[PDB]
Amino acid sequence: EPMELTNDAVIKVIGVGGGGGNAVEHMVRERIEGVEFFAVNTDAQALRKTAVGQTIQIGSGITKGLGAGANPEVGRNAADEDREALRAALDGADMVFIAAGMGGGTGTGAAPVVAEVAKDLGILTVAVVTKPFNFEGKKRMAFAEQGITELSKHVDSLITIPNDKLLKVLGRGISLLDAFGAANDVLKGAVQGIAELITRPGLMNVDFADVRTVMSEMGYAMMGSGVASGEDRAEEAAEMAISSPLLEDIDLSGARGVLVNITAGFDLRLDEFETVGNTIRAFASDNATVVIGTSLDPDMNDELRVTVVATGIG
Amino acid sequence: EPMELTNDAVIKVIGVGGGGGNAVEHMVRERIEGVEFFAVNTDAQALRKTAVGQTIQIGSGITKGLGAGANPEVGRNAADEDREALRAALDGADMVFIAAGMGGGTGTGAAPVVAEVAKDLGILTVAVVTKPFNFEGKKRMAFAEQGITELSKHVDSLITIPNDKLLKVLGRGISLLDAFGAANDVLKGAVQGIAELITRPGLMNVDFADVRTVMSEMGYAMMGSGVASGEDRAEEAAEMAISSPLLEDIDLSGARGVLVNITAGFDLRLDEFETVGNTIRAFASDNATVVIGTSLDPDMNDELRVTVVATGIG
Amino acid sequence: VSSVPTKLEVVAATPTSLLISWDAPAVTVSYYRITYGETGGNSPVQEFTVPGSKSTATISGLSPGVDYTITVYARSAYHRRSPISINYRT
Amino acid sequence: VSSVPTKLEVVAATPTSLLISWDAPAVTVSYYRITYGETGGNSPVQEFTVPGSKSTATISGLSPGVDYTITVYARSAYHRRSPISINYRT
Amino acid sequence: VSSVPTKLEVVAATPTSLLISWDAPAVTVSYYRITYGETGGNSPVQEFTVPGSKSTATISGLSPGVDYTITVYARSAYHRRSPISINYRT
Amino acid sequence: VSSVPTKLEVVAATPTSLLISWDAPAVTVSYYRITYGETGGNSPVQEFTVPGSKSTATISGLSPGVDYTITVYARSAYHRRSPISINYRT
Amino acid sequence: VSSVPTKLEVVAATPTSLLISWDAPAVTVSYYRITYGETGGNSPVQEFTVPGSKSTATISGLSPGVDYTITVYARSAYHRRSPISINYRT
């Protein structure tokens, strides 16, 4: 107990379902720093193939290790019967990221249960879930909507990333493997943009309390990002982040809290910090809680990345 | 018992009779993945020649190892007296494929008994049986019809593949060895099309529960497949699968469940998945349970295979 | 012998099965109770019954290279004689 | 056995979890109380309850290479039978 | 043979082309997939399909004195048989 | 490959220049960051950016007979994938 | 235990400090009296009080490699229970 007050922030990322497990395996391969990774799945074979290091097989007495199918209720019952393993894995963390692909059985039904356990443990719970493409039918979309509505009741923030928004930036005649790799990259980008403010901060930094200020009991959230280089990198990156397709569904002036991550190298300037902050606060609302910090990437030169998370959209 | 919940799906294929044993030996040679193969025959010499790895000699006290002849009753009595060996071989499986050639003595009479044992063990039982050619006489056809009627009472799904439908695609002046090799290939194709959704799934996958949803307590089933390449591969393959000669005996709009397997390489696209699903759901009925998954063949490039199983025809 | 059946023969029908044969009884037997399992093994034996008109029984699912013990009980309404047991090493 | 449940099986579902299985009871059990912890360890054991209709329980957060002791209590309104305990070395 | 097609013949129609011939199939083939490239070469192979009613295929743009490997796939709705491969040195 | 871009080609357009080519990306790239310099040289590398709609880049002022290392970064708002590096000896 | 507090934990927050933790009391405590000093040392111990709503206390100015003894008194208007003492070697 005394050591829990004198340690670094513990951040856990749990992927629920096949899509969530694939996304978390991608995050493991791409080496997010200062984060522990878990995969939770009903299908034992898929779990045995996932290279995430620590795996939990839920619903072993309901699905026999053969998957929950396309039924969210079976996934919910599978997660309901193994709340002890979920509690044991989640315990000891300050922030938890729940990555899942809404629409299936395991992820859609089991993400709310993991979220409920994490919140009842007093953990800052951020759900980073996607919606299926329109190419996947209407049943998957209805399941995803129901699962998102259920999940919003047990999370602090819920970042929704519609896959249909990714179609605008995907190459023509692209295989679904590459499209879902892009979706994995977007989920990893959201997790990294929120977590690297804590794990690898810059000189102008924010602490876990600042993050919890805008990520706690907020509800629905959206995420957008932008990059730029040259002399006008700050303004271009900020405007590109505000005008992200993953943010166009909402109005930034209605959000109850904005979290901004500026990733750069050793050449960020004070006026660039000021202009990014001014752009965000100009396109936000007057009474919104705005938290702006910087992260450090040693391999960025003359370039600047800006990530914006808008919370409390409702 | 605890390990039975944390293991891969166990799929067993049992060939009953001489034709079934030949088909299962063909499947062994062609290397279906993640499947265990058995041959059950009254003739001990034929069993000694079958290279399937695990063999069971039924009726050793009624036929003395000399075969049951062309009498289905003798085959039924031969299988009835060795229900313990059948139970011991079948036990421990999630799905069982019973491959046989209807018309003879051993297969026609013994496939229903193996099916009854498998169902009483609580196993998903799929019977993939053929009917004899019209070149084989009327007695074989009557025996086959009686055996199929008897077998339909103890199976979850019964896929009937009439050999007369194969005559439309067989070369002119073809020896019966090549015709029955084609029949073996068709039986292996049915087994592989149902089992590779589980054994080697794609990125858009279905689990054993999804398969059991459309393959359980359904009754009669039919199977059709198609291939295509180029830009229009998905629509062409789907339309060719719907218009298969092995499916023309029924109407796809009367089936109570449709199982679709899309086999492709690493270049399947989302719109292709959507258009195959849309074609199948357009030519099916509104309230039919449609399950669509993908399988992976690394050696397929720019080409696409679609397998359709229609269940609950009645 | 004092045990019914008096004779017991086991033959490997297939590399993973066994054929079991016993002599005909002098008194009608209603059914035969066969209990097979690994010799000196902690796992419970497997049991099944064949009708008394039969004289052979086939057991499957046998792991090669493992000793097996087979016992046959002859259950009749007219006696309570002892069973006969045999050992077979696959 | 005199203890309910009479049989207890443990299987490592994942390299950091355990699956626990017990036999069905002859008398209805309202819930099962499972207490797991390091064998001969000073730290207090972890405890949780599953409903009595269940037959399996999964425990997570287990350090590999460390011995564990698992005890299952069958709590019914119709008996007060002893628990059953097992030792598993991860 | 176990591979469809079973026979494969290659003839140099012109000093910079090859004519490829295979036997007729016992079962209807929808199309043939031919993949040709330098034998043991890092460059990706070239691929094209001919309809299944055909029995010959001509490939052009071949550098003389360079080994080539040709593989033919017979794609039918009724089997998934292996392809057949041949080596030709121009 | 895990690095965007996945393919990188370099051609000497003139005896004192190099043409650099990479494959099209699956996800929109805003700009490409190219860093070229002498391989294993103490001098700082030269850097420039081309827009993401481009697929080629020309670098000049290259001394013949000197090794060069070229690295391309694909900067997109939707990923942070690794760069790809190539070595060319003029 | 008979002493309030019943549990006492010490952790080295920094190489020259210690973090002290005790369990919550069953009865309201007005303040805690902590007395720390070198174990078996002639020098007088250092003393300070924290309010009873707290559960942790940090002590600084600690020489590494020197044993320390820490005693916590729970002063309440409703009991006069004994203190608890711990030994920590820096």
Ligand SMILES: Nc1nc2c(ncn2[C@@H]2O[C@H](COP(=O)(O)OP(=O)(O)O)[C@@H](O)[C@H]2O)c(=O)[nH]1
């Ligand atoms: N990011 C990502 N999303 C996926 C992947 N596979 C599937 N999805 C999405 O996740 C949703 C749920 O599918 P899936 O997770 O496989 O089903 P489940 O395992 O039963 O929960 C689908 O609608 C897909 O849109 C993947 O590999 N990566």
Ligand SMILES: Nc1nc2c(ncn2[C@@H]2O[C@H](COP(=O)(O)OP(=O)(O)O)[C@@H](O)[C@H]2O)c(=O)[nH]1
């Ligand atoms: N697929 C396939 N079917 C066969 C083969 N041989 C026979 N059949 C068919 O199976 C039916 C039953 O014959 P068979 O299995 O040999 O008789 P049984 O062994 O006494 O059951 C016949 O009507 C044939 O049409 C074979 O090698 N392969």
